[PDB]
């Protein structure tokens, strides 16, 4: 029976890593835990910086993007010696168990520490979805919402103009959020790494859009996969059509989660105190058909 | 074959129903079908008011709130004589099929023109979620992000003052949108028509988060259920602390449809035009564990 337990964030933030360390620690409090804030990750674990964490600490979360604790890269994680002194750390302060939130990255030391006996829960925190054994990711969402208000005032200015834009979404691996954003946004043309591309082919598709009378088109496409700017000089070259590229970048990151994102958040951390009482370790949480499930660490990673 | 079909949206409008009628225009356009938009939903029909689509028409409308076709009242529409009439007029304009939006209140209407002859498809298109069969309707994560942003500002204000703000939010019989918003919200305490309630208990509730130290709180309540005016006097008077009550209303079924929403409607709008061509009618569409399903209309009536 666990009497304290940790909780940190690691990997790219997300809007509603903040919702869920507030999950946590509202339900950890409600039965009589006491909760430990990690800072920066595994590299605060690592350090020793922490912080206690009380009903009032994260009284204003829910709105709040970002991660309240910070979020780091400690790769160096991959050392034994180094997850020893985490552990002597965790020891040190009588933490019983850890929730970690992050992509895939932060996973596998969630592992590792369950393997030197470290219980440990981990809740999907992504703006891109590629975490397997949940629907969706806490973060996707808002990051959804991030890119078609932008498209939205694209196809604004596209319109006004008669020219074509190409916008470059985040998601390096997955091309959900480019794809639920191409839908979303009523963008004609996508292009993402599940698929096979080909400028040639897409050339063709835009022709034939514009001579049935497209003023205006809007292609959505994953980050790295081509060079946009470039994408887009090809495009003019053989339409004759004005187009030039955008990229989004970082403003998807952040942000006000969206209700979605606050209520997958607040469900996930309670749940994962639900998780620690009854001795699980090592399981990594998610959504499926609605429903909070949880898996073994392994299968994620 | 089918050659026709007639698009039509009825009951409470609901954000999203743009997104929904676009689909089905694009969809039958595809496939060689000619669409027919029927202007006030059921009085239209009988009144025959309609308008030929095409994809100009629809071209801007996947951001846009409310129908462009509206949506009105005409429980006449029971009366099996007034329903002659909208044979007449079917039979008149060729239209074989048709694809109706709405409320329960408007599927039945659907069944009957499928018993007389003309399949019918009904997307679920509601702010409150009140239809069977479907995990979600159109236009409810739409109204869920207005109940919550204003969640958020009522939140700013009650803080500033230590006040008990109690918001009354829509859906009659249904306390889904209260449920999320309370959650989303970070609402203390909830009232859904699904839980007895004790005003009484409420007070216990609110006298015990305020020893606690809860300087402020904001109550999320149901329609229907109270006069707020009267239950924030009720609670001014026994907690000693200043409560008001705030009735969003109708701001609720408006505005731009968020991602979801557009998506949903986008999908349903295609997937009837599917359901038209394969043979079936008198089946009502519906999201379930995230794939698309439809129902004989008689069991979600």
Same mark, same amino acid.
């Given at each position: 029976m666990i009497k304290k337990i940790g909780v940190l964030t690691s990997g790219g933030d997300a809007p509603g890593m903040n919702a869920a360390i507030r999950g946590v620690v509202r339900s950890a409090l409600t039965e009589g835990l006491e909760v430990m804030g990690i800072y920066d990750g595994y590299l605060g674990l690592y350090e020793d910086r922490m912080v206690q964490l009380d009903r009032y600490s994260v009284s204003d979360m829910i709105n709040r993007g970002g991660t309240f604790l910070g979020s780091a890269r400690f790769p160096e994680f991959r050392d034994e010696n180094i997850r020893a002194v985490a552990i002597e750390n965790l020891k040190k302060r009588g933490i019983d168990a850890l929730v970690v939130i992050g992509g895939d990255g932060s996973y596998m030391g969630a592992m590792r520490l369950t393997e030197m006996g470290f219980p440990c829960i981990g809740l999907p925190g992504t703006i891109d979805n590629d975490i397997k054994g949940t629907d969706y990711t806490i973060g996707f969402f808002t990051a959804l919402s991030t890119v078609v208000e932008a498209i939205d005032r694209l196809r604004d200015t596209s319109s006004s103009h008669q020219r074509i834009s190409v916008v470059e979404v985040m998601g390096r691996y997955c091309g959900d959020l $480019?794809? /639920? /954003? /191409? #839908?979303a946004g009523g963008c004609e043309f996508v292009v993402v790494p599940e698929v096979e591309f080909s400028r040639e082919d897409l050339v063709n598709e835009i022709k034939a859009g514009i001579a049935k009378g497209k003023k205006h088109? #809007? %292609?959505? #496409? $994953?980050?790295?996969?081509?060079? %946009?700017?470039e994408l887009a000089h090809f495009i003019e070259k053989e339409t004759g059509r004005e187009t030039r590229a955008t990229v989004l970048g970082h403003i998807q990151r952040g942000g006000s989660p969206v209700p979605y994102d606050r209520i997958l958040a607040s469900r996930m951390g309670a749940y994962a105190i639900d998780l620690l009482l009854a001795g699980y370790g090592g399981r990594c949480v998610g959504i499926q058909n609605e429903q909070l499930v949880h898996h073994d660490i392994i299968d994620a990673i």
């Open positions: $480019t794809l /639920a /954003a /191409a #839908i088109a #809007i %292609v959505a #496409i $994953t980050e790295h996969m081509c060079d %946009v700017d």
